[PDB]
Design a protein around this ligand. Sequence first.
Ligand SMILES: O=C(O)CCCC[C@@H]1SC[C@@H]2NC(=O)N[C@@H]21
Ligand SMILES: O=C(O)CCCC[C@@H]1SC[C@@H]2NC(=O)N[C@@H]21
Ligand SMILES: O=C(O)CCCC[C@@H]1SC[C@@H]2NC(=O)N[C@@H]21
Ligand SMILES: O=C(O)CCCC[C@@H]1SC[C@@H]2NC(=O)N[C@@H]21
Lengths: 242, 242
Amino acid sequence: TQPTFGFTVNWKFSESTTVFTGQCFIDRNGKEVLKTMWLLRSSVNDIGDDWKATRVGINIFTRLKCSLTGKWTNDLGSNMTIGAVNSRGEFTGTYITAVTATSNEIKESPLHGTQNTIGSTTVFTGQCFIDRNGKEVLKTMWLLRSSVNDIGDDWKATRVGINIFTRLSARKCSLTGKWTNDLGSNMTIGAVNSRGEFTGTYITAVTATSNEIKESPLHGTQNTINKRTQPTFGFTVNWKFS
Amino acid sequence: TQPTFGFTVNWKFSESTTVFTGQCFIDRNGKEVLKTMWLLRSSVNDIGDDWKATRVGINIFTRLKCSLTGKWTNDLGSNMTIGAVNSRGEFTGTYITAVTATSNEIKESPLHGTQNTIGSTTVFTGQCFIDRNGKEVLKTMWLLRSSVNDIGDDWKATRVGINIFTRLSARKCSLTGKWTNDLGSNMTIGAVNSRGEFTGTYITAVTATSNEIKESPLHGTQNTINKRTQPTFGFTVNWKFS
Ligand SMILES: O=C(O)CCCC[C@@H]1SC[C@@H]2NC(=O)N[C@@H]21
Ligand SMILES: O=C(O)CCCC[C@@H]1SC[C@@H]2NC(=O)N[C@@H]21
Ligand SMILES: O=C(O)CCCC[C@@H]1SC[C@@H]2NC(=O)N[C@@H]21
Ligand SMILES: O=C(O)CCCC[C@@H]1SC[C@@H]2NC(=O)N[C@@H]21
């Protein structure tokens, strides 16, 4: 049972973010395959258009325990490079998409993700809006990837839903702070560095497994193309004891 | 435990299809609420663009056992009317969306769906392509809605994934025939009438419950706006013994 992972692609040629989540399998004749689902979050101008901002699909990655480190290609012809995976399961890499949903010239983009140390993964993606009352809101969608024991159960490993987060001059919408969502969960996000990267912790008020879930770490980025006041973002929660 | 349902909205002002799936709850002070997730399938010109054709989100419907019959409004301001639900759980209705992803003037559109008689529901949406070799392929995405026992578990009730179907002069892509997908499942679809409606049966090769699933009925529509050779479509599988 190779672990689950998620990652965020911080696109450098548009204001969008993609999150990918899934699981590596050593099935076919010793070959490794990443089975993933993604959410592509587009930047919208107002919260009223939020409902149409999120696309969904799959990618199967093959090479160019089931190490993520290395170079991979997917079914759409995209390539990604993933470097060393640290002890906390953290990894960074670069992605070159072969295809785009926006009318911009493609640029190689960074990715940051985490693999489940020893278990499930959730990736969230959305946009940080300043509401009419000046409060920040995160409107997000997520994919919750469960571990399966054979590739034949991969089809049923991914749940989807939404979360709205609110914080516990309102010029730029910033991810830093302590947040609660509509399910009762809480997260804290640290400073967002110049590369748009941020770290935090997450305590979910709800579970889909019968394990004890502890406070779990999160790593993500915020998109900085055209330096928007309402940036898209993505993050991966690496569930602990899950 | 109010049952699960799914339905297909056959849009009349664009070449798209939306499927909705979810569950009615009598929570708040006797009030009924439909918790649903949807996939919006856009029409693309070639199979190479299929990957970006599908959007995802939620809607909560409230009124304008948990009967679907009646008039409902959702959180985006859309209205739908659902008429009588028959003994097989089949229903039809009309939908007026308040919002659009295409640059066309909005028109009231038919919907056709099914509620689970006594259990889960799957909705599929996709596009019927003629491949380069002239074979038909259905590229689809689905949401599998499970029944939960309280609204508090609604967040975890929906799985997402894909299926590719192939058939067991190639001018127009037609849904009629016997199909298999990449999981081993089989479906048969009857004639597609002038309104784009069709009926069929589905035998899944795989399950996410520990019940015995029998052959289960399906009802859907194909989109006929600009009479495309590669129409989008949606259908609901009303799982039996599930
Ligand atoms: O269009 C954009 O806004 C950015 C590029 C999005 C590329 C998507 S991510 C999901 C899918 N998988 C890929 O390898 N490329 C596309
Ligand atoms: O069940 C697991 O495997 C780990 C916990 C999953 C919690 C999910 S992630 C999406 C949703 N939003 C939350 O704040 N919690 C749940
Ligand atoms: O833009 C289109 O192609 C057709 C209209 C789509 C309307 C979508 S369906 C999901 C969401 N819920 C609604 O009530 N309206 C939008
Ligand atoms: O598990 C259930 O509750 C009923 C069966 C679900 C079968 C799913 S639907 C999507 C996927 N595609 C298939 O052909 N079968 C599975």
